[PDB]
């Protein structure tokens, strides 16, 4: 045989195994491919990889600035480096070198006659919410990660527990915490507004046993079934009303006024209320069945997350539940997608990922006890944790 | 589910063992391509968001001395033990180790203790650690500056070392080479980085006797002039592989680098000669004038000047051997194109295909006689040039 024939055969077999399974099996296969790559690389390969994989975010940012990915995604035929350069207003040599690099990391695809077509990654980077995620990685995460090593060295490697005293303050030369500082930056606010439009899949309703959790709960008089606290575009409310259209009870999306305004266009005309509410203030809706917090508490250290829960707890009755939908990394063998997040949010927000036991300790500080845990993603675990009053 | 994954790992491991280092490199590139093709859109953005953590966390571990310590440890270590020994917060240490284990920077045991992986050992080696630190402190800033630099300037073709992303990244008018002389810690890290020797090298495929022909070392001619030879690894390996070939073997570099090289050079057989390769070549009529990973760091203008400084010293039998990257016309790999982007951003230079090398050398009056590749699939080659 030959190295090329062996490589093609590996690809053929891995592709057959991947299609055959579901999305969780494909995620497990991808994690295995990454681990194999790390185990088989040479020392020089390790250093080269660490040196050069960072180029991907910068070059994706350049392609986004140029509008290259959306343009290539709508192109019917392969495009030369000339055509793309002239159309997008880029230097021809610069464009050619960028495209060669992008093709080498599958950001685009290069044809046999050295022309260019969209890849899966091209299409992904053309989607506004995902492009906004990439831009957030470049303009928000990279600086904090840049500042983290010298920040830890200066401070003799402390345990970071405060949002106002972490790498972010050094990275952006400010006293403010990340959220307060971002509120003053219009372009970053706009990018976050676009990033909110991305909807994760799957969601908690794929495994959440709603009827069982409800039991004999009654919606009268005018009680709320579901209060989506910091619900963003209200994707959770939309999916809930879609899956259980005949279930009685108010479905309430709570967020800040600008986000609710952004959400108005894609919300259904009836069945979901938009209610301006700051979750650092007491919860107005009394005795709701579910108070839902998805990807909220992960962004706050224990003190602030506890304060958010303490703003909710006095509104609960015996049947009320607080549903924390968030990451629940394992005690051991956590994956890169749950630990890298931990490092990023430590550096930018002073917060952390929490194991199930850590979630239970935090919630017990608020007077809550865990009743059930409903995983809905694998192998990186996201779960809806249902808490009741102690 | 688990079983299938374990079987894939077993099979890929066996296939990697079945082949040589070039086959393993091809397999690794295939695994990367498969990962990119099979990831979800969300996975793509997540990977791009989080893989940046690896360099920062490796830098932290290097600052702590974690990798060398773990590399010398006889038994698995708890996060508590590592934190107390290295002077790190216990919570911070535990979170760092969890992250590192997730990317194989260390290995986590079933009882949540930690041992060295191949990557731990790699990051403990001074030259490779220095490469990682160079990526963090030198490359990252320039790459972070590149998008806004290009946007500000309406996306120009970068051709000048004094007008690229580096100037914006480090708020200076100087080119990278002038600016480095004013930075002590970066100079020290580069000094350590010079001690790393790439493998394999050109002598694995270079037909020395064939290229030599009937060339005579008599009466006192030079066989090999290593221009910008650094530690002189090429000279050392040449004398090791061809101990009986006569002729002077000369390491040329700047005085601080030659002083650094003196300790590990052999006691005899290799001359250390101070020479700035921006000035005429002093050694006349040598058989091989060797430039390894030199010209890639310069735009066409300066690289041409470097070659023109050598050409007048050549006789009919002299050859200029450019040992450098020769990426293909199409299908270039990430390790050659990422380098192209980095050196564009920092130095204003570029990677060159074989045709581009031949055009550059023809401007100096040189013609390509032979090309001897010695790495795959990323192409490094010794290109042998003679007078036109
Ligand atoms: C992770 S994002 C949205 C997550 C959303 N629950 C989801 O999964 O679809 C965080 C959300 O919290 C909102 N938010 C931030 N600060 C808030 C506050 N003080 N009061 C209410 N909502 C807030 C933001 O507007 C944003 O929509
Ligand atoms: C890529 S590093 C050394 C690579 C070396 N040829 C090898 O492959 O082993 C570049 C080398 O060029 C040297 N150098 C830089 N400027 C120089 C100059 N003006 N004259 C001579 N050497 C120089 C540096 O000291 C450094 O050793």
UniProtKB/Swiss-Prot annotation, chain B:
EC number: 2.1.1.-
Effect of inactivating the gene: Resulted in about a 5-fold reduction in leporin C accumulation while leporin B is not detected.
Single GO MF descriptor: O-methyltransferase activity
Name of the featured protein: O-methyltransferase lepI
Keyword Chloroplast: no
Task of the protein: O-methyltransferase; part of the gene cluster 23 that mediates the biosynthesis of a family of 2-pyridones known as leporins. The hybrid PKS-NRPS synthetase lepA and the enoyl reductase lepG are responsible for fusion of phenylalanine with a hexaketide and subsequent release of the stable tetramic acid precursor, pre-leporin C. Because lepA lacks a designated enoylreductase (ER) domain, the required activity is provided the enoyl reductase lepG. It is possible that the dehydrogenase lepF also participates in production of pre-leporin C.
Annotated keywords: Methyltransferase, S-adenosyl-L-methionine, Transferase
Family: Belongs to the class I-like SAM-binding methyltransferase superfamily. Cation-independent O-methyltransferase family.
Record gene name: lepI
Binding, S-adenosyl-L-methionine: 228-229, 253, 276-277, 292
Positions that bind substrate: 136-149
Stretches for region Substrate binding: 176-196
Organism of derivation: Aspergillus flavus (strain ATCC 200026 / FGSC A1120 / IAM 13836 / NRRL 3357 / JCM 12722 / SRRC 167)
Leader sequence segment: none
One BP annotation, GO: methylation
SS bond list: none
């Amino acid at each position: 045989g030959s190295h090329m024939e062996t490589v093609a055969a590996i690809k053929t077999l891995i592709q057959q195994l991947a299609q055959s399974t579901d999305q969780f099996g494909r995620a497990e296969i991808n994690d295995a491919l990454r681990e194999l790559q790390y185990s088989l690389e040479t020392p020089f390969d390790t250093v080269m990889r660490m040196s050069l994989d960072t180029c991907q975010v910068a070059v994706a940012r350049i392609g986004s600035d140029l509008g290259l990915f959306k343009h290539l995604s709508q192109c019917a035929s392969p495009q030369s480096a000339e055509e793309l350069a002239d159309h997008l207003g880029c230097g021809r040599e610069l464009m050619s070198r960028l495209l060669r690099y992008m093709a080498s990391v599958r950001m685009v695809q290069q044809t046999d006659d050295i022309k260019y077509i969209s890849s899966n990654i091209t299409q992904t980077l053309a989607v506004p919410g995902l492009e906004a995620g990439m831009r957030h990685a470049f303009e928000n995460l990279w600086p904090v990660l840049m500042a983290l090593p010298d920040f830890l060295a200066e401070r003799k490697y402390p345990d970071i527990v405060d949002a106002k005293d972490t790498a972010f303050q050094k990275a952006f030369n400010t006293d403010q915490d990340c959220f307060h500082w971002l509120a003053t930056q219009p372009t970053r606010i706009a990018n976050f507004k676009v990033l909110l439009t991305d909807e994760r899949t799957p969601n908690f309703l794929s495994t959440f046993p709603l009827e069982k959790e409800l039991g004999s709960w009654s919606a009268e008089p005018e009680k709320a079934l579901f209060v989506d606290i910091g619900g963003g575009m209200g994707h959770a409310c939309i999916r809930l009303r879609e899956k259980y259209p005949n279930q009685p009870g108010r479905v309430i999306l709570q967020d800040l006024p600008p986000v609710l305004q952004a959400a108005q266009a894609t919300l259904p005309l009836s069945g979901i209320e938009s209610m301006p509410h700051n979750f650092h203030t007491p919860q107005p809706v009394q005795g709701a069945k579910f108070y839902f917090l998805r990807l909220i508490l992960r962004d706050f250290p224990d003190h602030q997350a506890l304060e958010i829960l303490q703003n909710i707890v006095p509104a609960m009755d015996a049947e009320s539940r607080i549903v924390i939908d968030d990451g629940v990394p394992p005690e051991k063998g956590a994956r890169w997608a749950e630990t890298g997040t931990d490092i990023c949010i430590m550096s930018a927000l002073g917060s952390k990922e929490r194991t199930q036991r850590q979630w239970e300790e935090l919630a017990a500080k608020a007077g809550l006890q865990l009743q059930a845990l409903y995983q809905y993603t694998w192998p990186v675990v996201n779960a809806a944790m249902v808490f009741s009053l102690q």
